[PDB]
Design an enzyme around this catalytic site. Structure first.
Site, mmCIF file in Angstrom:
data_model
loop_
_atom_site.group_PDB
_atom_site.id
_atom_site.type_symbol
_atom_site.label_atom_id
_atom_site.label_comp_id
_atom_site.label_asym_id
_atom_site.label_seq_id
_atom_site.Cartn_x
_atom_site.Cartn_y
_atom_site.Cartn_z
ATOM 1 N N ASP A 1 1.237 5.070 0.605
ATOM 2 C CA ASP A 1 0.560 6.219 1.202
ATOM 3 C C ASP A 1 1.434 7.447 1.128
ATOM 4 O O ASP A 1 2.007 7.951 2.102
ATOM 5 C CB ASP A 1 0.219 5.912 2.699
ATOM 6 N N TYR B 1 -11.290 12.030 5.368
ATOM 7 C CA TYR B 1 -11.254 12.486 6.802
ATOM 8 C C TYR B 1 -10.168 13.551 6.845
ATOM 9 O O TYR B 1 -9.490 13.829 5.827
ATOM 10 C CB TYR B 1 -11.005 11.303 7.781
ATOM 11 N N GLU C 1 1.786 11.088 0.979
ATOM 12 C CA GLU C 1 0.999 12.289 1.363
ATOM 13 C C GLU C 1 1.885 13.524 1.114
ATOM 14 O O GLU C 1 2.693 13.879 2.021
ATOM 15 C CB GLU C 1 0.573 12.179 2.857
ATOM 16 N N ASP D 1 0.856 -1.176 0.000
ATOM 17 C CA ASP D 1 0.000 0.000 0.000
ATOM 18 C C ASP D 1 0.896 1.231 0.000
ATOM 19 O O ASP D 1 1.761 1.344 0.928
ATOM 20 C CB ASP D 1 -0.916 -0.052 1.233
HETATM 21 C C1 LIG Z 1 -2.356 13.321 10.147
HETATM 22 C C2 LIG Z 1 -2.098 14.809 9.840
HETATM 23 C C3 LIG Z 1 -3.077 15.851 10.347
HETATM 24 N N1 LIG Z 1 -2.699 17.188 10.022
HETATM 25 C C4 LIG Z 1 -1.773 18.041 10.691
HETATM 26 N N2 LIG Z 1 -1.714 19.182 10.128
HETATM 27 C C5 LIG Z 1 -2.569 19.048 9.047
HETATM 28 C C6 LIG Z 1 -3.150 17.815 8.947
HETATM 29 C C7 LIG Z 1 -4.055 17.486 7.939
HETATM 30 O O1 LIG Z 1 -4.521 16.346 7.775
HETATM 31 N N3 LIG Z 1 -4.306 18.443 7.010
HETATM 32 C C8 LIG Z 1 -5.273 18.129 5.869
HETATM 33 C C9 LIG Z 1 -4.494 17.508 4.675
HETATM 34 C C10 LIG Z 1 -5.198 17.737 3.248
HETATM 35 C C11 LIG Z 1 -6.614 17.125 3.487
HETATM 36 C C12 LIG Z 1 -7.423 17.124 2.224
HETATM 37 C C13 LIG Z 1 -6.834 17.445 1.009
HETATM 38 O O2 LIG Z 1 -8.622 16.636 2.243
HETATM 39 C C14 LIG Z 1 -3.671 19.719 7.085
HETATM 40 O O3 LIG Z 1 -3.923 20.587 6.233
HETATM 41 N N4 LIG Z 1 -2.792 20.008 8.111
HETATM 42 C C15 LIG Z 1 -2.040 21.307 8.291
#
Ligand SMILES: CCCn1cnc2c1c(=O)n(CCCCC(C)=O)c(=O)n2C
Ligand SMILES: CCCn1cnc2c1c(=O)n(CCCCC(C)=O)c(=O)n2C
Length: 575
Positions: free
Chosen positions: A292, A370, A294, A290
């Protein structure tokens, strides 16, 4: 006849053999800790002190001859190689012209990383996880995290395995640039440095060998001298219990994606893909990979990384190249291997990959529906909603509007349906998409009633900061709380609110919240109702199924609702 061989048990490692050698009481580079052999080297000492010794020995496993060799006087070492793990009744026979004599039978163990030597795992599952008869075509996935065995105290034998089709094991790192890992604090970055000592950049490693294969779990029958322990031995035993389960290693995630941004150079992809093939030969309980990342194009943990032009083509090429590699393993082993990926679903994430191209190589896409809103800023909203909530402004949902300052929205709002429809519209097949459900909440404090523009909707308020709490409350980091912590500290058994919290639900968004109007604590999460709504949305669109992050945070309610909301449905599996 010759004198019957007498097996020297302590001269033969008590008949315990392993195709994998794992360092046990140290932490070092991955290549110095882990050594895999296609064939186990079996060496069994025996003696014949009385009588005649004979000429030749034969070794039998379960009455079948597996090896032969020369007798050497009164003490002989039977040495042979054997590929198939298992437990066998061994006999050793000595022969000459006069006849043959054989030892008493004794059990020999040949350990392998498919768990072929192991009995089915004994389970210890919270009885709130209920039984269902969901059709086997539909995906019911979850992510199990390696570090959940520490403070979270959630081990492999706690998983409701009969309620899962896929376990994604989070997370395997890639050696190389990993500054984002330092955001976790503690030992995470330094443990990676140790794992990667002597390892080429862009190869995979195990982050935490203690958790993965050294720690002895007494519920699994481990003892200190057991040759494979940890989560990995438990996963192997789980696979003997539930042979149709797929267990897939998750590479990357929020903190471990920094190396992917160098996959614009094919050389680094080649190195990575080879290392994955080796990994899957080493750890045979895994069924695929998988990815992932990001995220292609950025917007993840690394504010200085991301290339909207080049990362999508790199992603696609990676998928291309992984699928070539997995087809080599399927030719070599006769097994079926899956290739999957978890992806961002904001419009700005999806626009940086041509998924109509990538998905032809992939079994499933785990859509990250999410983390749409959260405590990284002070703006409340539904973190895991299907649709646009009441709190959104005119034209926010579809992106044609303007914000409170008159500035254009740059694209559609963060909702699950806006992302799923962007993927469908460019030709990703519905039956490769798996919809995500959250087993946690995100939240704020300071959202008091005086901050709301609509007094009926706390999602129209403003925060002062993140939700704060303790680990007993399921608050492992500020702003995030396990679902089972929301249920114990804010909902209560009847789901009508405790501790000063009230329950509400945005029926348009399909999204629950709990709010304490005295503290201004507000939490956005998934509940029974919203997960039933996701299941019926998945049935209506013909999605592959549902997955969840992360299984330790549930009490049974969320996975139960996943199956509840899928009742009656079937889907065409990708072929
Ligand atoms: C696990 C990390 C959490 N986390 C910590 N800081 C974060 C995040 C997070 O998830 N997202 C959303 C990411 C893009 C979501 C979308 C395109 O639907 C953020 O923007 N920031 C600043
Ligand atoms: C967000 C939760 C924190 N968190 C998020 N991702 C994480 C962690 C974490 O704590 N560790 C600890 C690893 C130490 C390994 C070892 C050999 O001791 C991780 O590895 N990863 C990937």
């Amino acid at each position: 006849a010759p004198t019957a061989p007498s097996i020297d048990m302590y001269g033969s490692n008590n008949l315990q053999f392993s195709k994998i050698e794992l360092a046990m009481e140290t932490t070092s580079g991955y290549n110095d800790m882990v050594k895999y052999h296609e064939l186990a080297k079996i060496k069994v000492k025996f003696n014949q002190w009385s009588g005649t010794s004979g000429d030749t020995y034969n070794v039998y496993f379960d009455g079948v001859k597996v090896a032969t060799g020369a007798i050497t006087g009164s003490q002989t070492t039977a040495s042979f190689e054997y590929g198939q793990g298992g437990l066998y009744q061994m006999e050793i026979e000595a022969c000459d012209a006069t006849g043959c004599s054989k030892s008493a039978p004794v059990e020999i163990t040949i350990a392998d990383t498919d768990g072929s030597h192991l009995k089915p795992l004994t389970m210890n599952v919270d009885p709130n996880n209920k039984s269902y008869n969901t059709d086997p075509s539909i995906v019911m996935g979850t992510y199990f995290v390696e570090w959940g065995i520490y403070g979270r105290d959630y081990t492999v034998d706690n998983m409701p395995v009969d309620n899962l089709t896929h376990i994604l094991y989070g997370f395997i790192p890639i050696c190389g640039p990993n500054e984002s890992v330092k955001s976790v604090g503690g030992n995470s970055f330094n443990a990676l440095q140790t794992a990667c000592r002597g390892v080429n950049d862009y190869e995979v490693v195990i982050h935490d060998p203690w958790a993965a294969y050294q720690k002895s779990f007494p519920q699994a029958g481990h003892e200190y001298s057991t040759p494979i322990k940890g989560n990995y031995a438990m996963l192997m035993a789980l696979k003997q219990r539930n042979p149709d389960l797929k267990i897939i290693p998750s590479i990357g995630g929020w903190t471990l994606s920094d190396p992917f941004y160098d996959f614009v150079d094919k050389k680094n992809r080649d190195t990575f893909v080879a290392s994955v093939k080796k990994f899957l030969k080493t750890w045979k309980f895994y069924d695929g990979v998988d990815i992932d990342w990001e995220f292609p194009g950025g917007g993840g943990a690394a504010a200085d990384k991301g290339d909207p032009v080049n990362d999508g083509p790199a992603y696609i090429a990676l998928m291309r190249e992984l699928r070539v590699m997995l087809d080599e393993l399927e030719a070599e082993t006769g097994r079926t291997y899956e290739l999957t990926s978890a992806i961002g679903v904001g419009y700005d994430k999806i626009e940086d990959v041509d998924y109509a191209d990538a998905v032809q190589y992939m079994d499933y896409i785990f859509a990250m529906t999410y983390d749409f809103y959260g405590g990284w800023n002070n703006v409340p909203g539904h973190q895991t909603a299907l649709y646009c909530g009441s709190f959104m402004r005119p034209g926010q949902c579809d992106g044609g509007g303007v914000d409170e300052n008159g500035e254009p929205y740059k694209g559609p709002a963060y909702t699950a349906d806006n992302g799923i429809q962007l993927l469908l519209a460019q030709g990703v097949p519905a039956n490769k998409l798996v919809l995500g459900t959250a087993m946690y909440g995100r939240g704020w404090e300071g959202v008091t009633p005086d901050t709301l523009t609509d007094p009926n909707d706390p999602m129209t308020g403003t925060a002062t900061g993140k939700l704060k709490g303790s680990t007993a409350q399921g608050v492992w980091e500020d702003g995030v709380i396990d679902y089972k912590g929301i249920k114990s500290f804010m909902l209560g058994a009847n789901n009508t609110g405790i501790n000063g919290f009230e329950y509400g639900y945005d029926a348009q968004a399909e999204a629950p919240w709990v709010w304490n109007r005295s503290t201004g604590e507000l939490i956005t999460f998934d509940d029974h109702r919203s997960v039933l709504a996701k299941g019926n949305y998945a049935k209506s669109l013909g999605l592959a199924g549902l997955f969840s992050w992360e299984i330790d945070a549930d009490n049974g309610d969320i996975l139960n609702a996943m199956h509840e909301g899928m009742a009656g449905g079937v889907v065409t599996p990708p072929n």
